[PDB]
Amino acid sequence: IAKVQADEQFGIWLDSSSPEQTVPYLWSEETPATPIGQAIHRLLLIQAFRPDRLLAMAHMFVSTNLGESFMSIMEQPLDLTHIVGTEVKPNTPVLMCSVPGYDASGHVEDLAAEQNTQITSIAIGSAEGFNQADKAINTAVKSGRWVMLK
Amino acid sequence: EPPPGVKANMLRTFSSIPVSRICKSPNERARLYFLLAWFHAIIQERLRYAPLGWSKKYEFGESDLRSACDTVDTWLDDTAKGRQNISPDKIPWSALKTLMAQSIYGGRVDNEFDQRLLNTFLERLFTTRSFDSEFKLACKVDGHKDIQMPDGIRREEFVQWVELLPDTQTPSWLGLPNNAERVLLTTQGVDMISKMLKMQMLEDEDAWMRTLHTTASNWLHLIPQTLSHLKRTVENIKDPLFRFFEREVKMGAKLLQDVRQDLADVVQVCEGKKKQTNYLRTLINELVKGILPRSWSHYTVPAGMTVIQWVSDFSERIKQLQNISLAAASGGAKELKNIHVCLGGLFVPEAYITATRQYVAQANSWSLEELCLEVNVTTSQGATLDACSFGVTGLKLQGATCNNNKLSLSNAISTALPLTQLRWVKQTNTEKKASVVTLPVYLNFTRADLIFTVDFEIATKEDPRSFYERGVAVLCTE
Amino acid sequence: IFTGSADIKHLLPVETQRFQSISTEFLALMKKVSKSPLVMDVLNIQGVQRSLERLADLLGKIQKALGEYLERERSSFPRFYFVGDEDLLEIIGNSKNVAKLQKHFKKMFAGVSSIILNEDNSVVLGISSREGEEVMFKTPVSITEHPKINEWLTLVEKEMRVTLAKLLAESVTEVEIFGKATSIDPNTYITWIDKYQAQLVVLSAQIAWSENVETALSSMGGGGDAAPLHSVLSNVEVTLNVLADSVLMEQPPLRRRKLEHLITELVHQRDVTRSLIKSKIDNAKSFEWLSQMRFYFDPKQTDVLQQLSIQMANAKFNYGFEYLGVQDKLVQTPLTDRCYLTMTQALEARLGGSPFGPAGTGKTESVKALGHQLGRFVLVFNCDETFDFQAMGRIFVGLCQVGAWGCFDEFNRLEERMLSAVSQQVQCIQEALREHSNPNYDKTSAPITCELLNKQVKVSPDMAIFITMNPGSNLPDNLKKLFRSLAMTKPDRQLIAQVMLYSQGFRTAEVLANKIVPFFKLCDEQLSSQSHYDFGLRALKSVLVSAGNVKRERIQKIKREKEERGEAVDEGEIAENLPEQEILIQSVCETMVPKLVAEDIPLLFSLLSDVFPGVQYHRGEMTALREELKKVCQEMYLTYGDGEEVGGMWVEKVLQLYQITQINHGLMMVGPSGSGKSMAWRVLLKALERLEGVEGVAHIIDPKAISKDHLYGTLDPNTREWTDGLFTHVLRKIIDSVRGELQKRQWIVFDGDVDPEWVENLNSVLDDNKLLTLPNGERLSLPPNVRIMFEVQDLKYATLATVSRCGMVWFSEDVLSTDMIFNNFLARLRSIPLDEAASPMLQIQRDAATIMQPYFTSNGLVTKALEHAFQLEHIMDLTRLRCLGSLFSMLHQACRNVAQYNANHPDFPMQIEQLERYIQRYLVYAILWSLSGDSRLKMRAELGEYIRRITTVPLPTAPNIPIIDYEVSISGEWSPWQAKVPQIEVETHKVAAPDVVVPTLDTVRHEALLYTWLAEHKPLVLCGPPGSGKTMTLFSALRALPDMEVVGLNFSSATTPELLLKTFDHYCEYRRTPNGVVLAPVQLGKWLVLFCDEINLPDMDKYGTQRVISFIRQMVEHGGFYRTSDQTWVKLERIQFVGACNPPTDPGRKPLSHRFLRHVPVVYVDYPGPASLTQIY
Ligand SMILES: Nc1ncnc2c1ncn2[C@@H]1O[C@H](COP(=O)(O)OP(=O)(O)OP(=O)(O)O)[C@@H](O)[C@H]1O
Ligand SMILES: Nc1ncnc2c1ncn2[C@@H]1O[C@H](COP(=O)(O)OP(=O)(O)O)[C@@H](O)[C@H]1O
Ligand SMILES: [Mg+2]
C-alpha cells in the first residue's frame, strides 16, 4: 500500500494495455528473488491489480518456468501427417472430436490425399451405415487401408 | 475448434457458399451475400462476449446462414425477373429485414432486448445506403477507425477485401465497447484459477475439519445474529409496501435461522460434539468445496456464486432488512414509503416494483394497468420524495453515464446510480420519443433475470441504436 | 385372415384354395404330433423337416400374395394406408355392410367420423363429423353404380372436396352481400352462420377480411386517407359485438361452437388491422401487409378446388378442402403469427418445419392449427412409448400419396434405433420434396418419387412433415440440413382471455381481459404459498366460464322479473345495462374465495380493489338452501350458524362447497384433519336431495389402499381380457343406469390422498374432455350428474395438473370449533341410545348429559384442560379430535356403568344425587386419562395439578397422590387404585408363564382403560418403550372380556394391505346378507381383535402415505372396504383393531397420519420402574 501511494508512475502502468510486461517492483524481499520468484510475484500483482491480464501473466510465468516456445507448437497448425504416420497404433482409433458447429472430415480427407492412402468415408448415423462400417473395418483391418467413420 | 474472428468467419462463409451461387445474376447478389456474411460473422462473434453481446448463447449455426441465403436468392430473383442488374432501391429491403428478424435469426431469439438488438443490426446493415461507397460497416473501430464497405461488385473482390482485413480485431468491430474484451479476459482468468484449484484439491486428497471449523465460525461472525419481525396490524395490512416488507422480513429471518443452525451443527461436528448425518455431511462437503448449498440457496443469485460471496451478500441483505424493520417499528406507514431500499438487497425486487405500483394505485384510486414508470436520477443527498416517487439506491448503470438524467455513452465498465427515484405516473397514449431509450434493469451481471425496463433520455446526439449495440443496461446489484 | 371373414374367400380365390390344401396338410401333421407328443417321436416323423420347409415356403407365398393384393387395394385408394392390415381386410370384406365401415372413417379422414347413405344404403348422400355437423353432397355418390369400395370411396372423397368448394363459393357470395349492406343485421348473420359449416364460415370471414383490407389499402395508396382502414376496423369491432350478443343469448351447441370460432377469428382480424393502422400502411405491396396470411378467392377459376389461394409473404398455398369438422380454433397471438411465418417460409422453401421448446408451449397445437388453416389433413404421431415402425412406413406412403401432413409430437421420445430409422425415412421423403423446388425438373410433368417400402411412391407436393422436439433436444444430423427449427414460448394469456370473455358474451372483453390476467399474476405473487393454490390458465378458464354463467343468470333473472310484470322484454337492453366488471368480480370471488386461507381473503380483496377499483362484491345467501341445511343439521345433531355465530364459518364453507359443485364437476376439499369437510359434503348432499328432489349417492373410495392397477382395472396380457377396476366399474354402472341411476346425484368421493400416480388416468376425466380412456380402448364418458370429489387432507405431493383441474375448497381447522364438537357429543348423547325416553338407559343418558352440560361450554373445564394438554408434551402428535373422541367414549362408558348399576340393583336405581357425584368425578377422571393418557407420568401429574387448580369438582383430598391414581366407583366418592392391586401368590408351575401378570398399579389402571375402550369397540392403540406390557395389558383386558377372539398381526416395514387381506380371508367369511356383502369372523358371537404389533413400522409410500394405515383408517371410519376381485362394499361385522406401536422417535417408526390418529385413542405404557419391578419379579 505504501509503495503504491509513493509510486507516481503507478497510474501509467495500471492504466496500460499490457501491464504484465512491465509490472513494477512492489514487493520487499531479503535476498534477490530468482526469475521464477519474480514471475510468480508479478503473477500475484497482476491478479490483484489487473485480473484481465492474468492470462497473459500466466503465459509469461509458464514461459519463464518451461521455456518461451513451450506453447509455440500449439499455435502451429496440426501436424496430422506425422501424428498419423507414427506415435499412433493401428488398433488405436483417432477420436477427432470437434466442437458443435464444425466438421473435421476435411482434414482427414486432405491427409489421405496427401499420403496417397485409400480412405473409406462412412456416415455412422445410418442404420445400414452400421453394417457398412463393420464390413469396411473387417476388410481394411487386413487390407491396410484407412477407415472414416462420421 | 473454429478459428475465432470476424475475418475467419467471413472466409469460412464465403468458402462454404458456392462461387457459382454468388456469381448468378443479378450482380447485386454478390453484395447481398457479402452483407449476409458480415451479419452472420458479427452475431456469431458477439455470442462469445455474452451476456454483453447476447443475453444467452444462441445457436446461430450454419442452418441460419443457409436459410438467409435461400431467402435472399428467392426474393432477389423474384424482384429482378432475370435482369442482369437492378437498382439498389428496388431490392426488397423491408422483406429481407423482416424475414431475417422474425424467421431466419429471430426464431431462436426469445428475449425482447435480443430481438431489439437483432432488429437494430438488420436495420443498420440491410439498407439502400449499404450500396453507397461510404458505407461504414462499423464505427469507432479500434478506438478511432471505420470499417468501410468494399466497393467491388464481384465475389473475387469481396473475398480479397475479406482477406486484407487487419489482424487487430476489437469488440468495436462487433459494436460492443472495447472493455468487453477485458471482461471476457478476466472471466477466463477466474475460470482458469478455478480449474487449477480443482486440480490442486484432487492432489491435496493424496486438518480439513479444523479449517472447516474456522470457516464456519468466520461465517457465523459474518452473518448477523438475528432479524426481528414486523407487526401485523389492521391499519397496516392494507399497505402494499408493508405487506411486501413482511414477506421479505419473514423469508430473510427463516433463511437466517436455517443457515445459523447449519453453521452451528457444522461447528459441533468439527469439535466432535455431533456426528455427520446425510444432510450434514453433504453440507460439509459443499462448504469445503466452496459450492453454494442448495438448501441455503432460496433467493435467485448469480450462477456460480461462491459461499463466501453468498454469505457476504446475506449479511448485507439482513443489515438492510434490520434497517427497514427498525423503520417499520418506528412507524410502519410513512417510513416504509420514504425508505431508500437497495433493489439488489431485496430477495424479489420485482415484488418491490409491484408493491410500489400498488401503493400508488391505492393512494390515487387508480387501476394498476394505468400506471407508467418514470425514473429521475437525482444526486442530492436524501432528496425529498414526491407523493408517488419512490427511491432506490445501489443501481449500477452499465456502459453509460447519467448526467442531468441524460445518458451519454461511456467507455467505463459501470457507473453507480444514486437515488434513481422510481416514480409512477398515469399512463398516457403519447408516442415513444426518438431520444428516449428503453434500458433493461437486470438483477445481476448475468442478465438472465429481468426486473423492469426504465426509459432514460439519451444526451446530445447519441444514437439510440449505438446504445442497443453497446448493450447498455442497468443492474440492481454489481 | 381367411376363415375369420367369409368374404375374403371371394376376394382372394386360388389363394384360399392353396391355404385350404396347406391347412389340410398342417392339420394332418398336428394330428400326428398329438398322437406322439414326444420331441424325439416328432423328429422321427418321416420327412418332417422337408414337410415343414415346404409348408413354410407355400404359406409365405400366399401371405405375400395377400400382401400384394392389399398393396394394390391401398394404391387404388391412397387413404387406405392409414388403417391397419386387419382393419383394411375388415373394410374390404364388409363392403356390403357399410355399417361396419363407420369406425374406420375416423382413421381415414380428418373430420369424417361417419357417412350418411340412402335408406337402403344404395347411394351416399353426405358425410358427418364427430360433432354431428353434416355436409350433404351436391351430387350423391352412388354405391350401386360403383360397387367396388375403392371405386366409390374415391368418389366420396372427390365429392366431399367439390361440395366444400361450392359451399365456400356460395358462402363468400353471401358474405359479400352482407358487406354491401353496410351494417350487418344479427338475424341474417345468424342465419348465414347456421346455414354454413364452421370451417367454411371461418374461411368466408377470412376471405372477406382479406379482400376488404386489400381494397382499403388500394384506395388509401398514395395519400394519408386512413378512412378505409378505419372503416374496416370499425366493421370488425361491430361484428365482434354482434357475435358477443349472439353467443350470450341462447344457442344450440353447434352454433355456439361456430360463434366461438368466428370470435376467435375476428379478434385476430381486429388485432392485425390495428397493427396495420398503427404502422400506417400505404399500399398493399408493403411487407407489413404481405407478412399476414391472405385468402384470395377467384370466382373465375374453372377448377372449384383451386379457387381459394392462401398466400402469406413468399409462400402461396391453396386450400386442401379437407372436411375438418368443428375443431376448437387456436387463438392467434402475434407469437403464433410469427410461428406461422416461419413454418410457411419453410414450406415454401420445401423444408419441413420443426418447432421446439418447453412442453406446454403448443408446438404440435400450432402445427395442427396451421395445417387446418391451410385445410390439410394433419396426422399427429405421438412418440411417448406408443410408437411403432411396422405401420410408420405405410403411413408415410399414405401421406405422400394423399397430400396429408404429419406431426411428430416430442420426436426425441423415440429410442436410438427407432429415431435413426424414422429419421432416415423422413430424410428420404424430405429430399424427394426438395426435388420439387429445382428449376431443371419439368414441373408440368414432374413425377417425383421416393424410396419407401422398397418401392416408388409418387410424393405429392402438398405433403409436409413437422418434427416437433422438446429440448432436454437436438435435431437429427442427417436431416438437420432439411428442417428449419423454430422456438416456441408461452402464449398470450391476455389474448386467450379476450377471446374467451368475448365468447362468453362480454362486450367489454378487452378491458376485462387486460384486468383479470394481471390480477391473477398479482394473486400468484402477493398471496401466500399454499399447495392447493391454482392461478393458472385453467383457473382463468373456470373463472371466465363462471362469469358467463353469472351474466346469463342475471339476464334470465331480469327477464323473469320483467315477464312477471307487464313491461316488455328486450334481452339486448338487459345485456347492455348489466355491469360486466361486477359480474366478473362476483365470479372471481365465488371461485377464488373458497380456496383461500383465512389470511389471504383480505389480501385478495385488496388486490381486487387495486385491479378493479370501485367494484364491490356482495354474496347473496341462498335462503332455501340455508333452511334445508339447518333442517339436515338438526336431524344430524350438528350445529348450524347464520354467520358470526357458532357454526357460521362451517355453514359458509358448505355453501362455498355447493357453489364449487355447481361451477366444476371435479373438486377437492383440502383442509387439516378434523375440520368438518366430510360432514359438510354429506350434509350438502342430503340437503340438495331434500330441496331439489334428486336423490344423492356417495361412492366413498379410498385410492391409496387399493393399488392403481386394481383401481383402474387391467387388461390381461393374454386374450386381451379387460378387468374393471373400482373407478371404472362405478363409471360403467352409472353409464348403464340399470336401476335408473342417471337421474340421481352421484358423488364419487375419493376420500384419501392425491399422489402423482393414481390421478394420471383421472386427469383426462377432470379435464374438459370428461373421458376415461382405457388401454382396452373403451372411452368412458363422464355423465353430467356425477361429481368427482376429493377429501384430501393436504396437497403436499399433489400435481399441478390435478390442482388446476379440481376446484378447491379450503377447510381450515377453525371452521369446526370445540363448541361445535361438544354440542354434537351432547346432542348424540341425549338423542341416540347407546344400547340399541325410549329406554331407561336413554333416560340415564339424558340425566348424564344434563349433569355434564356446565362442563361442555365455550370456557369450561374440558376446554381449558384441552388447551393445557395441547401445551403439554405427548408421545404422538396430540389432536383435538383424538382427545375428544377418547373423552366421549369414556363418558359413554360412564353412563353404561350407571345402567349396569341400575341392573345390578333393580329395586333401588341410580339416585340423582349419587349420579351427579359419579358423573362429576368421572368427568375429571376421563379428562385426565384422555388428555394425559398418551403422555409420561410427569406430564400426567402436571395436567392433574392444573385440573386441581382450575376445577370445581371436590377431587380426592390426597396430600401428594396424583388424581390419576384414583378410581371413581359407582358411588360418587373417589377410591384409590392401590386398593385394587392384590398381593397374589404365583404358583411354581407358572413362575414366568407367558400369561401370568403380577397385579401392579399400572396394570390395574391400563386394564381398566382397555376394558372401557374395548367395550366401546374403539380402535385402541398402545404406545410405550419396547418391553412395556402393551401386549400383556391387552391380553389381560381381553381375558377379562368374555367373548373376544384375538388375532396377532406383526407389521414389518413392507406390509402392504395384503397381509391384512390374507388374515381376513383366513379368519373371516365373505357372507352376503340381504343388506349387502358383510365381512365377519368364521366363529360366531366373538369379536375379532386384529391386534397389530407394530402399527408405525409400515414404510411410507413415495409420497408419505402408509398403505396399511390408510386401509385401517378406511375400515374404522366407513366400516368396511372394497373387494378388488368383485368391486363391492364389504362391511365389517365383528372386526375390531388394536395396535401396540413403539414411539415415533424410535428409529424406523413412521408417525401416524392425523386422519388415522383421530379415531384411535393412544395409551403410553411405560417401563414398570424400580418399585414396580421389585414387586412384580
Ligand atoms: N357441523 C358440525 N357440528 C358439530 N360437530 C361437527 C360438525 N361437523 C363435524 N363435526 C364434528 O367433527 C367430526 C366430523 O368431522 P371431521 O372433520 O372429523 O370429518 P372429516 O372431514 O372426514 O375428517 P378428516 O379431515 O380428519 O378426514 C366429529 O367429531 C363431529 O362431531
Ligand atoms: N406385571 C407384570 N407381570 C408379568 N410380566 C410382566 C409384568 N410387567 C412386565 N412384564 C414383562 O414384560 C415383558 C414385555 O411385555 P410385553 O407386553 O410382551 O411387551 P411389548 O408390548 O413391548 O411387546 C414380558 O416378559 C412380561 O412378562
Ligand atoms: Mg371425511
Side-chain angles (χ1 to χ4, degrees), chain B residues 278-299:
Chain B
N278 312 305
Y279 169 60
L280 262 278
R281 88 222 308 171
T282 305
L283 192 173
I284 279 164
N285 167 55
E286 302 327 297
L287 296 202
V288 159
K289 284 189 174 178
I291 275 175
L292 181 50
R294 318 232 334 175
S295 66
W296 283 3
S297 100
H298 282 347
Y299 56 107

Side-chain angles (χ1 to χ4, degrees), chain C residues 671-677 793 813 879-881 1154-1156 1158:
Chain C
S673 161
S675 149
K677 55 201 90 159
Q793 183 179 5
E813 186 94 15
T879 68
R880 167 192 61 214
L881 267 197
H1154 296 131
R1155 278 164 80 98
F1156 169 63
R1158 156 183 170 232

